[PDB]
């Protein structure tokens, strides 16, 4: 009602549509490190013997 | 154990109060989690 809204909006994504309204997925990889040993390393490829 | 920013768990299970046979503890697991315990209990 007035000075009433539902705060989540759909993105109405549809095929005709823009580039500029499109799916674009997004992946934030970030890079955490603390005072305990790490953990987490790197394939680290070697040599015939 | 936990003294250089690795916890570290050796153990034994060794067939039969405390027997004068010896048996020395094999290292199992060396985990790098770094955080302070100074604590502890039993999970029943």
């Not at chain 1, 823009?18 to 997004?26: A, D």
């Not at chain 2, 154990?1 to 153990?11: E, L, R, T, V």
Request: charged residues 15%; glycine residues 8%; proline residues 10%.
């Amino acid at each position: 009602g007035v000075n009433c809204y539902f705060p989540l909006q759909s993105y109405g994504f549809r095929p005709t549509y823009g580039v500029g309204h499109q799916p674009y997925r997004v992946v934030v990889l970030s890079f955490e490190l603390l005072h305990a040993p790490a953990t987490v390393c790197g394939p680290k490829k070697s040599t015939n013997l | 154990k936990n003294i250089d920013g690795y916890f570290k768990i050796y153990s034994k299970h060794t067939p039969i109060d405390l027997p004068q046979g010896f048996s020395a503890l094999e290292p199992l697991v060396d985990l790098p989690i770094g955080i302070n315990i100074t604590r502890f209990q039993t999970l029943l």
